[PDB]
């Protein structure tokens, strides 16, 4: 079986590229004929983006020397015109004019889980509808080849240029091949400009040095498919197989040198002998009905059947067998299936709060491992066009130019999924005491909430005067 | 069955003749080779007078343009049940994997795919400069005769009249008859290439053997070809003026081996006369739907589901090579 | 088994186009026949839209310099217009005269979850009974071919017309089939209008770049057909083979080498002595009445019998495997199946919250991803009709005008089900930590509830003031 | 067994529209013979209406300019009239004059679940026992076909006369059927009249665009029917066979080649033999007298016994076959069997009140879904038919005509069945959160519970100046 495929003894990167074409297309079809991919993208989705993506702007006040008071009237603005760019209700961020910042992140997160790899370039839009001319249009994995599809060379691996150190300077961006008859060429795009501007986005996880693409998914997914395969078509025999019947005619006869002198006669030439028992077998099934049920039975003269002797009939096993096995893979792509397809067998309090924190942690790990890069490149290249139409006003102190210090500046977080619940009783004595031992920030607390602290406080007083005014209780 | 880039070889070693006289390689999108077609000599004398210009200028109209390429696809096994060529200890734990055997011995087994095409137009090259006529045949196919049009004057023999063989094994000089037969080449003859024996009564002759520089001499690149393909081809040394050569290669046909050459035959021309490697049709729906109807070979590795399940490696090849002047070499047979 | 359905190895979009028809009818086929889908799309209503859909206007006020108070009461006129304009009882806001908004997103997002994508199309109405001419028919994903069914171009790709950037222009709708017999023409629908207008809504969810089209249910349910199949045969004949019995007669006679050859005299030329055997079998037979039961004894004279030998007599195991598969694509498809069909087997408490929170996290990730797009689009085309009409005003301070930011202007979100319901104590400890604590705001304490602030303390005085009116205590 | 039930492979109007006679001949057939029919629309009937279906009119007062307090007033006194209308004890609001409105609701709900559609309509009454000369009669699905049963055609569609856009003009109503004697007639009837009066009141939910018809209940009910048969079937043979007794005679006799020998001569001319010994095994069980038990041993002479050898012989499985066939279908279907025949195995208190709230839940779904339809129809034709005759007294400040607004002012909501109880604790502990936050107002409160806020303050004040005046404590 483990000819079908086949794993060299080499660095993963080389071990990897040669076979990279033909490991996707079966990733591919895996992912298309199985259901397991979708559920585990929709997971990682609703995990680690959830329902939105929040910008949260802290330029670095303290050592930047800008006081924290214009930071965060800074960040107000900012944030402002960020929420009010993102919400384009006509879809009209993206140049396929047809994705807004939410599908940027889901395209950008489920391509770089597949491939390990995500690439966006920021295009000039020039849409007018809009006061900010950057668009980020996503870019195929097929689409980086080497120029004309040639292998690997020297500096030119995959589609990559790079060094001798290996720093990637560009690309070879293959011609887009929907409909499925447009050629390939490829066209030179460099990661980054020389000034910081972010123009090729080019987010992927290295498992290790000069490593140029991500993981896989169906070099460790051939098993469920031949797994499946195998149970699939095991259960057929077995149903097929639980009364299959034969349904022969014997009789006495047999008078052993008898009938071998018979048919020894018969062959040499006295074929009436065996003409004559045909024909009186043939009146005898034709006088009898010799009929078993709604069928007849199918025509056997004497002295044939068939020997449906089995095999060995010990159970099979398969039970322990998928059970050891969707546990073992289960822990192993990561998302547990005692909710990738649910099963509630003897699981117990603490199985299900354990298991719940230290999944939700780990989603935790990737959301900030794999989202962060994209958010923090987006809102860069939205920075700096925003500080090109001046939209929003740099501090007039700065220690550094906006051009120098864009790190400095354009430092932010993001939020991810809303707030988590599990049990209620965990949450609200987590809070409670939090609450009470100050032990809980503004910015960890709308953390673990989903929420803003300003918003929260403003809308309390707008509570607390609502309810003196209508005669409620505060 | 593996990919089609699993066809790398870089060995390119065919003895002198593909490579040197027949580079003119000309693969088609069209079954036949059309001679009207290809430009070959192009009409190149001609101007205009010096107020306008003349007419449009073609490919010449070639008389004769069908033929039909030797369409050669042959296939074998790379069955994983043998033990392969092991070269020296090389980590014999890769050719256990089922892997590495299966791709070495795809490599073993295409190799001898395209030296045995190698060889096979090797001997179509041998019939075309020795007589001009080429014999496009098999079973289940008609024998067709592909003639370049190899003169009678390039036919002549050195038995007619007064033989080598039947002259002074010490006085006699055969460069008088070098000159008689190389007059008529429609060009300068520089290689003298001889079968074994051929060369052994050319050089019986003293004046021959006290002619002949023995020296390197380094003339042209012959001497790095000698060197490449030490194997069948042997630069006996200078004559003075031309150089003096020996091939000795062997075809090893169906149940025995013989050598590619007559017993007594010399082909009089230049190294630099033009050969054509027109290439037909390559019938495979692989090569068609991603283009390769055009082309010099096509491999591949590839499973057959069913009564013969199993899984093979198949060449494909179209040549129909042929010499543009025939009158370029004149064919004697010796004494 | 995989004969009759055939994964291609390419890209999803080249491998779902080409067989688009073929899963799209089986599709059919199975959501026809099967009642799994029927419950699927009942329960994706329930949980996303519920009872109604609720329309709430949030005007960019911060970043467009709009007076929050101007906005809440222009949203107050524009939710009194919108709610009176929805609650037509004629049925009337459809170009089919026969659905409500209700059932606009009812049909919406049925077929976006079927097809994958929904088509809307903002038409002109022209009867007076209500102020806005502008009602929403939606259209068929039958009609979007390529004019006269040609097979996908260059720029004709499956009826949408694209660039080679692949921004959607416009779209061939072919002429409804219904009745059976009418022909299809292909008419030229633009996707939007320029100034912004939203002409056809086509919403779709693409899973890659250049997709045109959505998911899919049968190419991941062809395996419950054949199961079920499966299942379904296999107890068909456990339950008719249990007790079939073969009646036939036997006798001693059989005297072998005697037997042989009076069968072989009677072959050559002594038929008489079968005649007279069987003549004497029938008087057997009929002296005897051989009667077993009910029934007569078929008739067999003696020296033939049928050999109903069986096969192997291990336990089917399908328990097990449909327990198993049952699990398997139950949180494969997304919605448990210990609801689906209901199962109450070993079912535990933390078993019930966790399962439910999560799961109606996770519908709400699918509302909010599949709903809102909808419910903004109409809203837009609904909003800009009220603007030509001036039925409400807009802030006489715009920054910018109402079609320059529609987007800004038209911000809105909406409410889906009403008010979870799993466990009592479980939402009452949250609704009192959340009082008592204050973190929870007027925005999201109404999406948890499913009410609104200001009704609920205007109905608060009503209620305090009631009773001190009648005597009651407040 | 897929012969007798056959799928074509279109859209489903297109698949059902064919064999619309067929699959609901088939589908009275099991509604009539098995008892799962009744349950459900019983179930649904309690579940949806229940004791009653309550009317609350609520005027666009907001949008319409109106006071609340006047609309209130104005409310009270259409509610009153309604209430007083509708209580009519002599059946007499029908013009079969055998059905109240509870009926109306009864046999529109149960006709809108069996063929997913009903059709009521409001005709002019002539008995002058009321003050309202408007009855509703509901009119059988069998009436609408194509005049004189004609197959479908251009415009004119299984009986409904519509446009190429597919707008319900009118229908072609068959004369009735019963006596099984009448020939039918077609007769015209619009769907509704021009002015907005809703004439023929035709409320089906359509599962697709286009579509005519509602749902079945066969088309997925034909698996029961063969099920019981099967079950039913191999009951009885299992019963039948567990002791069915072979009561034959052998002798020791059988002398092989002798015996072959008599037999032959007997064929032959030896005859005599066989009676001589005929009448010795006769002799024998005439002085033997051959009993067993209560009965005689059939009679049966040397040399003939059946062979009941058997089938295998492993248990039959149907056990989990039928649990999981039925946990399988009633989570299809929709209401959960274990109350649809009531099993109490295993289930647990998460269980309890966990599938209550959402079966419940589910069942406000449906009643919002296909009861509101009925009910604000009625009330808009019993509305207009007040304001014809000047009994409730419209707002003089009308913003709108009545004619032109009656879906703003024949605005209207509807209570179905009563209070729900479940487990006690829970509602209470609900209610004494809701009393003590106020997050419940008199509208959802009253729905809750089933009762009205004024009525329950009016009885209050009532309560306590009986407690004062009698001695009680208030």
């Known amino acids: 079986q483990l000819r079908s495929w086949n794993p060299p003894s080499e660095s993963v990167d080389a071990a990897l590229l040669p076979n990279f074409t033909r490991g996707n297309a079966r990733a591919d079809d895996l992912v298309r004929n199985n259901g397991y991919a979708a559920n585990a993208i929709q997971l990682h989705q609703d995990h680690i983006v959830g329902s939105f993506f929040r910008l949260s702007h802290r330029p670095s006040w303290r050592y930047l020397g800008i006081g924290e008071e214009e930071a965060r009237a800074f960040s107000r603005e900012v944030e402002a015109a960020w929420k009010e760019f993102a919400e384009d209700d006509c879809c009209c961020i993206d140049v396929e004019r047809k994705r807004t910042f939410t599908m940027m992140i889901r395209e950008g997160v489920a391509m770089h889980a597949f491939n390990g790899e995500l690439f966006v370039q920021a295009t000039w839009d020039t849409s007018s509808s809009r006061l900010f001319r950057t668009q980020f249009r996503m870019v195929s994995p097929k689409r980086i080849s080497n120029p004309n599809n040639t292998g690997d060379s020297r500096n030119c691996r995959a589609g990559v240029q790079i060094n001798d150190s290996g720093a990637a300077l560009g690309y070879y961006v293959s011609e887009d091949g929907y409909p499925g008859w447009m050629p390939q060429k490829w066209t030179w795009i460099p990661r980054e400009l020389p000034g910081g501007r972010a123009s090729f986005i080019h987010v992927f996880e290295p498992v290790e040095d000069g490593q140029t693409r991500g993981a896989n998914v169906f070099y460790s997914v051939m098993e469920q498919m031949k797994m499946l395969d195998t149970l699939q078509n095991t259960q057929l025999q077995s149903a097929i197989v639980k009364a299959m019947y034969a349904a022969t005619i014997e009789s006495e006869l047999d008078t052993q040198s008898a009938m071998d002198f018979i048919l020894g006669a018969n062959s040499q030439e006295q074929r009436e002998r065996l003409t004559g028992w045909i024909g009186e077998i043939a009146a005898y099934y034709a006088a009898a009905p010799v009929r078993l049920g709604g069928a007849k039975v199918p025509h056997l003269m004497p002295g044939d059947s068939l020997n449906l002797q089995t095999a060995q009939d010990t159970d099979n096993g398969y039970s322990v067998f998928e059970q050891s096995l969707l546990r073992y893979i289960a822990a192993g792509l990561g998302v547990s299936y005692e909710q990738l397809s649910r099963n509630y067998a003897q699981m117990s309090y603490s199985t299900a709060r354990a298991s719940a924190n230290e999944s939700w942690a780990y989603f935790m790990g990737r959301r900030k491992f794999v989202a962060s890069r994209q958010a923090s490149q987006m809102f860069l290249c939205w920075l700096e066009e925003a500080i090109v139409r001046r939209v929003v006003t740099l501090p007039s102190k700065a220690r550094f130019s906006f051009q120098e210090a864009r790190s400095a500046w354009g430092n932010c977080d993001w939020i991810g999924s809303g707030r988590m619940a599990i049990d209620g009783l965990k949450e609200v004595q987590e809070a409670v005491m939090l609450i009470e031992a100050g032990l809980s920030t503004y910015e960890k607390e709308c953390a673990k909430r989903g929420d803003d602290y300003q918003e929260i406080f403003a809308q309390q007083v707008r509570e607390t005067m609502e309810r003196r005014a209508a005669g409620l209780k505060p | ?335």
Chains 1, 3, 4 share one sequence.
């Open chain 2, 1 to 335: 069955a593996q990919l089609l880039a699993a066809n790398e070889q870089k060995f390119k070693f065919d003895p002198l003749f593909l490579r040197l006289f027949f580079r003119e390689s000309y693969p088609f999108t069209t079954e036949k080779v059309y001679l009207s077609q290809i430009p070959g000599l192009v009409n190149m004398a001609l101007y205009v007078s010096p107020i306008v210009s003349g007419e449009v200028i073609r490919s010449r109209g070639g008389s004769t343009s069908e033929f039909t390429p030797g369409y050669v696809k042959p296939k074998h096994e790379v069955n994983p049940q043998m033990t392969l060529r092991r070269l020296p200890d090389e980590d014999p734990q890769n050719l256990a994997d089922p892997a590495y055997r299966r791709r070495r011995i795809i490599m073993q087994n295409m190799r001898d795919e395209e030296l045995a095409i190698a060889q096979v137009e090797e001997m179509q090259a041998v019939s075309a400069v020795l007589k001009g006529k080429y014999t496009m045949t098999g079973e289940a196919f008609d024998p067709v005769e592909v003639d370049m049009g190899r003169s009678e004057e390039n036919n002549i023999t050195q038995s007619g009249g007064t033989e080598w063989s039947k002259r002074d094994k010490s006085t006699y000089d055969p460069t008088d008859d070098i000159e008689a037969y190389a007059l008529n080449a429609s060009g300068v003859v520089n290689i003298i290439v001889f079968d074994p024996k051929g060369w052994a009564l050319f050089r019986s002759f003293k004046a021959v053997k006290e002619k002949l520089d023995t020296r390197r001499g380094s003339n042209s690149e012959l001497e790095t070809a000698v060197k490449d393909l030490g194997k069948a081809v042997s630069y006996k040394g200078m004559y003075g003026d031309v150089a003096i050569v020996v091939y000795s290669g062997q075809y090893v046909e169906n149940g025995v081996k013989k050598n590619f050459l007559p017993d007594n035959t010399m082909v009089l021309g230049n190294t630099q006369a033009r050969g054509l490697r027109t290439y037909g049709c390559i019938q495979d729906a692989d090569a068609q739907r991603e283009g390769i109807n055009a082309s010099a070979r096509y491999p591949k590795n590839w499973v057959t589901t069913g009564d013969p399940a199993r899984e093979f490696t198949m060449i494909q090849s179209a040549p129909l090579m042929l010499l543009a002047d025939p009158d370029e070499f004149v064919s004697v047979q010796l004494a």
